[PDB]
Amino acid sequence: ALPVSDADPFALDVLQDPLPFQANLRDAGPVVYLRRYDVFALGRYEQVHAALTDWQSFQSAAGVGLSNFRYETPWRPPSILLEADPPHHDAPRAVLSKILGPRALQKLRAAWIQDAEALVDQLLANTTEFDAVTDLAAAFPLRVFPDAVGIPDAGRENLLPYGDHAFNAFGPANGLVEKGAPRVAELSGWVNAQCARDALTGDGFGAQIWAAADRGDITYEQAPLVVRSLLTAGVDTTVNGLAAVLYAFATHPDQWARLRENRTLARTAFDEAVRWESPVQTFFRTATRDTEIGGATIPDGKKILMFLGAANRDPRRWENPEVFDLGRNPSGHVGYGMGIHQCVGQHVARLESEALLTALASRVHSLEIAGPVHRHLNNTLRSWESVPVKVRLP
Ligand code: HEM
Ligand SMILES: CCc1ccc(C(=O)O)cc1
């Protein structure tokens, strides 16, 4: 009965430009069987939302990549947040929810704002033409987030590769994964080292996680894996979200002026970029029982592929979805997911954006694309390689 398709969402040509595919997915029906992978794809907002929230029907503990941990060996000990269901999910989630929550981040705001202003000021002192990825979007998270976690300086060059491999590894064992598999032992080796109590400053998120373990909120065994979650999820996502927002502003002069005309728009600017780009494209779930969704039965034990990018551009939910518009209300986009696993780092992402955008807006009159943009292909993370920009100063 279902629409059925030979489309490969992880083919390089789709990864380079996934918008065609998303439209085809959404157009085919609520539920498309991807024969290539024996999973059920969902591309419309309504079903993606329903699948995300229904953790009882659609579990995470069997893996939220293609790989089914029922049968297949994980490349790493699975995340005790992302790949855990209730009740195991609950305690580590609650720890991060508190540590990364708005109240907690309040104390970092002025420092991050300040660090962003310094970054931008020093960049613009040297040059008004530069790569928005390497000089801003990549630079700024690396300058603030590792320090805030409180890991040592040694080995920080592993953060982006580690993150990229983890997101690739949610995909099939295709070239993007298999070309990374030599390096994982040394990648996994480093990150585990950063997660130990003795490797971490006694100030940052890491120390706070360990302090939560002292109170018994989590165990000393969970504590380093909780730190690990931050070091997997917390860097590459924000780099690519920041690249997207910068790309959006550089191609939308009116939206840029609107930001400049009201600095409180940063928050909603970043959230709209998250909707519009959807840096995290896809996640899987595993059906725990035969389940009806969008008219289709998902057999017990089979995986659903949720297309967050496609749901975020679904015209059933969004007016003129292709447009980047800070006048839009993007609240309810599924770019951070939805329900019990909804991104716990969203306050962290929004603050980085607020800091960087405020700093940029203070010093840049207008912003243009200065040269060809280039994507970095990844199975699950829409990644920006280069975004040459030129700025005009006041
Ligand atoms: C633009 C930035 C970000 C995007 C687009 C993003 C996206 C996501 C999405 C889609 C999920 C849901 C996973 C699922 O449903 O299976 C998620 C979960 C998560 N994110 Fe984020 N994220 C971002 C930034 C961050 C940051 C800065 C951190 C940490 C500081 C972080 C940590 C996490 C964690 C630990 C989870 C798992 C939570 C759970 O399973 O309960 N993310 N993120
Ligand atoms: C942002 C998607 C994501 C969420 C959590 C993890 C992790 O816990 O390692 C890794 C990736």
Author numbering: 7 to 400
What did the study's authors say about this model?
PbdA also catalyzed the hydroxylation and dehydrogenation of p-ethylbenzoate even though RHA1 did not grow on this compound. To investigate how widespread these activities are in the CYP199A subfamily, we characterized the ability of PbdA to bind and transform p-EB. PbdA bound p-EB with close to the same affinity as p-MBA, its preferred substrate. The transformation of p-EB by PbdAB was remarkably well-coupled to NADH consumption. Moreover, the apparent kcat/KM of PbdAB for p-EB was within 50% that for p-MBA. Finally, we analyzed the products of p-EB oxidation by RHA1 resting cells induced to express the PbdAB system. Both desaturation and hydroxylation products were detected, along with acetyl and epoxide derivatives presumably produced through secondary oxidation of the desaturation product. Despite the efficient oxidation of p-EB by PbdAB, RHA1 did not grow on this compound. PbdAB also efficiently catalyzed the hydroxylation and desaturation of p-EB, as reported in CYP199A4 (21). However, derivatives of Pseudomonas sp. B13 were evolved to utilize p-EB as a sole substrate via meta-cleavage, overcoming both regulation and enzyme inhibition, both of which are bottlenecks in its degradation by the WT strain. It is therefore likely that the high affinity and specificity of PbdA for p-EB reflect its chemical similarity to p-MBA and this is not a physiologically relevant reaction.
